[PDB]
Amino acid sequence: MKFAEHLSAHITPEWRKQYIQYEAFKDMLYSAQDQAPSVEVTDEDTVKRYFAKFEEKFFQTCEKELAKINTFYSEKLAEAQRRFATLQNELQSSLDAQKESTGSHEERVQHRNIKDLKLAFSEFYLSLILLQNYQNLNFTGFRKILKKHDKILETSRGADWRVAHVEVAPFYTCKKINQLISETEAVVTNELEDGDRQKAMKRLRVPPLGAAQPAPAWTTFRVGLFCGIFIVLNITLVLAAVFKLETDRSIWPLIRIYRGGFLLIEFLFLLGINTYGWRQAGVNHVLIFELNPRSNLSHQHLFEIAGFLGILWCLSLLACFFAPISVIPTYVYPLALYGFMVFFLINPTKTFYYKSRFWLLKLLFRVFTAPFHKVGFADFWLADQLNSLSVILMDLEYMICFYSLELKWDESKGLLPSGICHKYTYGVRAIVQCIPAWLRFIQCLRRYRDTKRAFPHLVNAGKYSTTFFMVTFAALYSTHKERGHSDTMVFFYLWIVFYIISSCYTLIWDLKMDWGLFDKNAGENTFLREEIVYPQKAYYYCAIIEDVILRFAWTIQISITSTTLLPHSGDIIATVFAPLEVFRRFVWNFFRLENEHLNNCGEFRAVRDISVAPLN
């Protein structure tokens, strides 16, 4: 297990088909050696005529692979040649503009131009480094496979073939890449950094990338520590709940308060697994989300954060069950928990994942002001997640109402004991249901405005608009049934029609457009698409089935929450179906990102394009 794993781990995914096929050659050689077509006694033709036809096919395949590698390298080299000239031309103009001006507003745009140029040069350097690594890996693969050939068949043809063709091949000989690498860093050192090579090389240097670097031991230790503490606290919580809770005490406000924290911690834990799967399968989420290719979080850090927050959630709930303090009222523990969560998110000090938190804060500001910002992939993705995390918004609204009105502060234990805050009487609940759908609807309309293409942005707008009709008719039915009016039946039929319409119209879009399945050119992969990234095929069928089932369950949860069913039945339904929506989104993320990535392949794009701004 030396080079097959190494080659599999060190390949740039977008060019996966352009590398040498090490596994194919090995298999061919093994099969041939295994099936030695020997003959009775000794036959010259049997043992030497077979070893005069396999080698020719082997060398024909080798020539084909070498030609493919040469063509790809030449094309990428030409592209780099053109890009360097473009960047050089762009860099001349800023200098030309300033010096003349010298011998506020323009200053800030000039600073922005400097930053944009410094980012574009870094991306160019990264592309050059990737091409160099491509050359090195391909040569190593040829050498090792030819040595294995000469070992297996006990002949010296491969050693001479390597010298005759591979060492003469242009991709091995051409030396323009090193000159480009030297020129780029010289220009960055002189023109931008004012002669300081150390700062420029700190910016330009590339560490190991992809799935080729393990996280530090002190992170794995902390992940395990937090997981163990969380497990033991859960066991103790269940035992205390079974053996200490009274029959008369009402637990429903407590459940409605802690549901949101449970959902958040679960969400983070599942997102960690999503990141692990994306990293392992070869899906480049760093390029899609436009993160820094040299500094970004792994799955260990997300596991670390989820466990740390779970410990605090468990401690707060456990202190609410018991009473470790004889003077502090029992209704300040959820307040402390959520205040600490908020302060952890918005900590201004440069500690505890400050870059990640600031990136997320900027993203959240961009999402909640939808019409006035250009829409990227991250904004779409985050608004989709918020579409499934609306039970948290309901829990927050209910907590605010309960603490404002229905809570008796006079009682020593008033956190656990009417009905005003858990119904849609004033209509706030209907609005808080429709906020995230409204954000996605506005984003789709803005995208149509920018692109000026009717399909498929207006179709998304309608898909998100159906929720408004469904919720409106549910609310009308519920408010007419309780007051005893004669129009209950018409609203019932309208609600069921719009329920089925919404469920079908979201499910079809999920299966056909978001995931890109059921393609005409499926071929052997029945009901799937032509190219698939994840290894097993049972994953796709299981995902289709669970999505079909869980799309019907999700719509009923939203309809039921607005005083539809009897309060007792409704509470048990919402609590159980809430985690299943987060599970459905967790499953959806895999294939949405895979379908997005498969577009990058076939265009062979490995680095994000940066467009420097022009002051003049």
Ligand X SMILES: O=P(O)(O)O[C@H]1[C@H](OP(=O)(O)O)[C@@H](OP(=O)(O)O)[C@H](OP(=O)(O)O)[C@@H](OP(=O)(O)O)[C@H]1OP(=O)(O)O
Ligand Y SMILES: CC(C)CCC[C@@H](C)[C@H]1CC[C@H]2[C@@H]3CC=C4C[C@@H](O)CC[C@]4(C)[C@H]3CC[C@]12C
Choosing from 33, 292, 451, 569, the residue that interacts with ligand POV (CB under 6 A) is 292
For residue 232, the partner it binds in ligand POV, a copy of itself, ligand Y, none, with Cβ less than 5 to 8 A by kind, is: a copy of itself
Measured from the CB atom, the residue of 35 and 526 that comes closer to ligand Y is 526
Binding residues for phosphate: 384, 387, 463-464, 551, 584-585
User: What would the two tokens of residue 359 be?
Assistant: 């990136």
What span, in angstroms and rounded, lies between the C-alpha atoms of 558 and 436?
A: 13
Scanning 153-161, 219-227, 515-523, 540-548 for contacts with a copy of itself by CB under 8 A, the matching segment is 219-227
> Quick check: 221 binds ligand POV (CB under 6 A)?
yes
> Quick check: 504 binds a copy of itself (CB under 8 A)?
no
> Quick check: 214 binds a copy of itself (CB under 8 A)?
yes
Residue 397's SS3 state is helix
> Quick check: 228 binds ligand POV (CB under 6 A)?
no
What is the number of residues in the chain? 616
Return all residues near 233 (Cβ < 8 A) that are at least 6 apart: 311, 314, 315, 318
Alpha helices in 216-298 (DSSP H): 217-244, 252-281, 285-289
Scanning 238-246, 352-360, 524-532, 545-553 for contacts with ligand POV by CB under 6 A, the matching segment is 352-360
Read off φ and ψ for residue 389, nearest 5 degrees.
-100, 40
**Binding site residues, ligand X, CB under 6 A:** 1-4, 144, 148, 151, 197-198, 201
> Quick check: 227 binds a copy of itself (CB under 8 A)?
yes
Last residue before each gap in the chain (C to N over 2.5 A)? 103, 417
**Shortest CB 67 distance to ligand X, Å:** 24
> Quick check: 556 binds ligand POV (CB under 6 A)?
no
> Quick check: 240 binds a copy of itself (CB under 8 A)?
no
How many chain residues interact with ligand POV (CB under 6 A)? Answer: 51
What span, in angstroms and rounded, lies between the C-alpha atoms of 70 and 445?
A: 46
> Quick check: 229 binds ligand Y (CB under 6 A)?
no
Residue 239's SS3 state is helix
> Quick check: 446 binds a copy of itself (CB under 8 A)?
no
> Quick check: 445 binds a copy of itself (CB under 8 A)?
no
> Quick check: 229 binds a copy of itself (CB under 8 A)?
yes
**Shortest CB 221 distance to ligand X, Å:** 27
Residue 502's SS3 state is helix
Choosing from 216, 329, 602, 614, the residue that interacts with ligand POV (CB under 6 A) is 216
Amino acid at 503: S
Q: What angle do CA 172, 177, 180 make, to 5 degrees?
A: 165
Site for ligand Y, residues 496 to 525, rule: CB under 6 A: none
CB 516 within 8 A of CB 595: yes
Choosing from 141, 253, 260, 436, the residue that interacts with ligand POV (CB under 6 A) is 260
Scanning 6-14, 220-228, 360-368, 395-403 for contacts with a copy of itself by CB under 8 A, the matching segment is 220-228
Neighbours of 365 (CB within 10 A): 10
Dihedral (CA of 326, 328, 330, 334) sign:
negative
For residue 605, the partner it binds in ligand Y, ligand X, a copy of itself, none, with Cβ less than 5 to 8 A by kind, is: none
For residue 236, the partner it binds in a copy of itself, ligand X, ligand POV, none, with Cβ less than 5 to 8 A by kind, is: a copy of itself
Write the burial class of residue 534 (CB in 10 Å: 0-12 exposed, 13-18 middle, 19+ buried): middle
How many chain residues interact with ligand Y (CB under 6 A)? Answer: 11
Write the burial class of residue 176 (CB in 10 Å: 0-12 exposed, 13-18 middle, 19+ buried): exposed
Each residue of 188-224: b (16+ CB within 10 Å) or e? bbeebbeeeeeebeebbeeeebebeeeeeeeeeebbe
Secondary structure letter of residue 406 according to DSSP: I
User: What would the two tokens of residue 360 be?
Assistant: 């997320």
What span, in angstroms and rounded, lies between the C-alpha atoms of 479 and 492?
A: 12
Residue with CB nearest ligand X?
A: 2
Measured from the CB atom, the residue of 2 and 175 that comes closer to ligand X is 2
Question: What is the contact surface with ligand Y in residues (CB under 6 A)?
Answer: 277, 280-281, 534, 539, 542-543, 545-546, 587, 590
Q: Which stretches of the chain bind ligand POV, using CB under 6 A?
A: 214, 216-218, 220-223, 226-227, 230, 260-261, 264-266, 269, 271, 273, 275-276, 289, 291-292, 295-297, 303-308, 310, 338, 341-342, 345, 352-353, 355-357, 359-360, 382, 386, 389, 392, 395-396
Q: Which residues bind a copy of itself (CB under 8 A)?
A: 214-215, 217, 220-229, 231-233, 236
